[PDB]
Amino acid sequence: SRICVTGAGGFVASWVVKLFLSKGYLVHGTVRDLGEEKTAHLRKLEGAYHNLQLFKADLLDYESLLGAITGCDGVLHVATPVPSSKTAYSGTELVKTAVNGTLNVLRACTEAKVKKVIYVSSTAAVLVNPNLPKDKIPDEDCWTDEEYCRTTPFFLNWYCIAKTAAEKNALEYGDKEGINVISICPSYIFGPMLQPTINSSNLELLRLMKGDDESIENKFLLMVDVRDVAEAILLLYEKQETSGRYISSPHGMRQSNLVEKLESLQPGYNYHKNFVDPSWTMISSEKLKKLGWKPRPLEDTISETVLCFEEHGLLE
Amino acid sequence: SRICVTGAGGFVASWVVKLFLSKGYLVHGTVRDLGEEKTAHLRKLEGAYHNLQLFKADLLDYESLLGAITGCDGVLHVATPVPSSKTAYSGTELVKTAVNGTLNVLRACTEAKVKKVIYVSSTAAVLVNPNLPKDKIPDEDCWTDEEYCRTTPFFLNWYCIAKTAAEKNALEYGDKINVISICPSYIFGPMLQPTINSSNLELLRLMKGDDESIENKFLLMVDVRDVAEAILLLYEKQETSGRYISSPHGMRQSNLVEKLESLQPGYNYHKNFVDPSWTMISSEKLKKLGWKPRPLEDTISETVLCFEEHGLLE
Ligand SMILES: NC(=O)c1ccc[n+]([C@@H]2O[C@H](COP(=O)([O-])OP(=O)(O)OC[C@H]3O[C@@H](n4cnc5c(N)ncnc54)[C@H](OP(=O)(O)O)[C@@H]3O)[C@@H](O)[C@H]2O)c1
Ligand SMILES: NC(=O)c1ccc[n+]([C@@H]2O[C@H](COP(=O)([O-])OP(=O)(O)OC[C@H]3O[C@@H](n4cnc5c(N)ncnc54)[C@H](OP(=O)(O)O)[C@@H]3O)[C@@H](O)[C@H]2O)c1
Known part of the structure; x- marks a missing residue:
């Protein structure tokens, strides 16, 4: 059986593709460029030579996507730029x-x-809502206020507007017949990289490791391992009695405390140490965990990301 | 006297024909490809040079089967795909x-x-019944609920529907012609064919440890060599008829992994699992005819030995 994966050369999509190859699936991965160095890390995957078929498609070209999708039992829309x-x-x-x-x-x-x-969405389509009270633990029923991001300027405002709009489009499209559309909304995704270039989330994790002196917000990061996201996507695809949103954000910490456990697990880097100073920080991933999803402890995600960082020579 | 054997290149069928050749029979073997690569392990069995006669037949091509079967005193229908x-x-x-x-x-x-x-059926055609109580020790007269298998999703559900329906149709047709059915458990044993089958694949699964936590299934078990000699015993015996269960052993996968680690150390066995009463089906109907299966530990250690020699653990 054949499944399609958009942007197979992406940070998340590479692990998704690697995992689905390991399970006997036939993958049709789309990329915007088929050059050997862009697609090297995908060709090397075990099972890829015989069961990986890479196309050159663009999300804004309906024909190329049609060609890549034709004949597939499912498809995992993972492709969205992350600034x-x-x-x-x-x-x-x-x-x-x-x-x-x-x-x-x-x-x-x-x-x-x-x-x-x-459809791979994000917690950015769930949490950014000022009207939702404080005694409320947000879950799959909470949506981000398009009004609010369109009103108030903050980095990733347009990203959130795009993610919510795309996820509302997909979910609503799913209530016809013969077409079940799921959405998964992880939070900040960390983990070892398969692709040669570093992505955005891993870059802000790397930013916390090369210390500076500017005064950052001590934001509360909610985090998930990319390998866990991939296995979550596997689990949600294979199980039939699925429907709706599924949040995947097992861990969550202040940047203060993330630097200190990193310092505790991986000494030898001049970590950043200059911060200043809620609720929603505790969204329940349980709709997923009730299906068997068991994320790994944050320490391993953390330590395996830092060593892949070093292998990529990003720390000198 | 001549006997036919469907899919002689299969895991079980290979042992069936080697045994029947060992006993002076003339066997007409069915395969879907006569290439020397896939039939090599059959040509080598002693007696095959003079007493093995291979035809090219497909189960959905009636005349191919007609050709391979005409002239044989008996048939051993063992060809059925197992995913x-x-x-x-x-x-x-x-x-x-x-x-x-x-x-x-x-x-x-x-x-x-x-x-x-x-006909070689399966316990999949006997046990998968939600209606049958837990107080009841299932035997040859409990059938599988095919609706349930088609309602409930689990890998090998359609397989269970296949084996039950096929075994239903076979014995129904037998009242037209002596038709016997043998229902074995999960079949383990050393392999004669070059490619690994599925049951031995999931034993190799249990041997290459990992981190994913798999179902602590209760596997009922029988040796492939014991299945062959059971088939021989059932055919040679003239006072046999109906179904015959062949499932001497049964253990949890965790206890199975530890008896395997106990007999074959030096491998990174799987050791994270999770979480019955159908586990004691009586093989007595067969054992009363003289069938004496071998202890499970021989079957598993010889199977892992062949795994080793086939280079499947690196
Ligand atoms: N990383 C996170 O922290 C995080 C958190 C929550 C949700 N998500 C979601 O996860 C998904 C994957 O993002 P990522 O983490 O893997 O970062 P990423 O590596 O930057 O993903 C970008 C992918 O999207 C492709 N892409 C961009 N524009 C495209 C276009 N017009 N047509 C086709 N492909 C296009 C890219 O193709 P090229 O290879 O050619 O560039 C690339 O494969 C996104 O939808 C994101 O919203 C990510
Ligand atoms: N494996 C077990 O643990 C187990 C357990 C319970 C019952 N059984 C029963 O044992 C029997 C054989 O299974 P196995 O263990 O030996 O695995 P197997 O090696 O995969 O047996 C498959 C055999 O069936 C043949 N086959 C499939 N479709 C065919 C078709 N359209 N026409 C002709 N032949 C076809 C195959 O021919 P080719 O060789 O040319 O592909 C092959 O010989 C089955 O009836 C099964 O229900 C097996």
Whole structure:
């Protein structure tokens, strides 16, 4: 049986693809460039030579996606750009990429008569809501206030607007017949990298390791291992009696405390040590855990990320 | 006297034919490919040079079966696909293969005037019943609820529907022609064929330890060599009929891993699991005819030995 994976060369999508290959699936992975160095890390995957088929598609090109999707039993829409802190993005076109790419993907699956789709969203589509009270522990029923991100300026405002809009489009599309559409919304994703380039979430983790002197927000990070996300996606695809959103955010700490456990597990780096100073920080991943999902302890995720960092020569 | 054997290149069928050749029989073996690569392990069995006669037949091609079967005193229908877990199968076509292939074999047998047939079924056609109570020790008269298997999702559910329906159809047709059925458990043992089958695949699964926590299934077990000699015993004996359960042993996968570690150390056995009363089905109907299976520990240690020599643990 064949499943499609959008952006197979991405941080998350590479582990998704590696895992699905290990389980006997036939993968159709889409990439925007088939050059050997971009796709090297995907070709090397065990089982890939015979059961991995990479296409050159773009989310805004309906035809290329149709070609990559035709004949697939499922498809895992993972492809959405994730802006870096050390850069600027155009909200207009990120919103355009996310929503229109999603619409195209969904149209292609209705055409190819795909049975199940799994859209990878984010907690950014759940938590950013100022009206939801404090005695409320947010879950899969809480949505992000599009009004609020459109009103108030903060980095990743447009990212959140794009993620919520794309996830509402996908979920709502799922209530026809013959088409079950799931959504998974992880929080900040950390873990060892398969791709040669470092992604955004891992870069802000790396930022905390190369100390500086600027005064950062002591934000509360909620975190999940990328390998756990992949196995969650496996679990949600294979089990039939699934429907709706599923939050995957097992761990959560202040940046203060994350630096100190990192310092405790991985000494030998001048970690950043200059912060200053809620509720929602405790969303229940239980809808997932009730299916058997068992995340790994944060220490291993942390230690395996730092050593892949070192292997990539990012620490000198 | 001549006997036919369907899918002679299979895991069980290979042992069936080697044994029958060991006993002076002339065996007509069915395969779907006559290439020397897939038939090599059969050509080498002593007696095959003079007394093995291989035909190219498919269970859904009636005349292929007719050709391989005509002229044989007995038939041993053992050809039925059994899916491996790390792939996917089409239950629709599997169960269609099993039942229609079984029907085709039986029609060919009454056309060729064969006198005895032995169908190889499974405990999957006996145990999977939610209606049967826990106080009841299941035997040869408890059938599987096929609706339940088609309602409940689990890998090998369609396989269970196949074996039950095929075994139902076979013995129904036998009242037309002596038709015996043997229902074995999970089959382990040394392999004669070059490619590993599915049951031995999941034993190799239990041997290569990991971190994922698998189901602590209760496996009922029988040796492939014991299945072969049971089939021989059932065919040679003239006072045999009906179903015969062949499942002498049964253990939890965790206890199974430790008896394996106990007999074969030096391997990173799987050791994280999770979490009955159908576990004591009586093989007495067979054992009363002289069938004496071997202890499970021989079967497993010899199976892992062949795993070793086939280079499957690196
Ligand atoms: N990383 C996190 O912390 C986090 C947290 C929550 C949710 N998520 C979600 O996880 C998913 C994967 O993101 P990631 O973590 O793996 O970071 P990433 O590596 O930057 O993912 C970017 C992927 O999207 C592809 N892409 C971008 N624009 C495309 C387009 N127009 N057409 C086709 N592909 C396009 C990229 O293809 P190329 O390889 O050609 O560049 C790349 O494969 C995203 O949907 C994200 O919202 C991530
Ligand atoms: N394996 C077990 O643990 C187990 C347990 C209980 C019952 N059984 C029963 O034992 C019997 C054989 O299974 P196995 O253990 O020996 O695994 P196996 O090696 O995979 O047996 C498959 C055999 O069936 C043949 N086959 C499949 N479709 C066919 C078709 N359309 N036409 C002709 N032949 C076809 C195959 O021919 P090729 O060789 O050419 O592919 C092969 O010989 C089955 O009836 C099974 O229900 C097995």
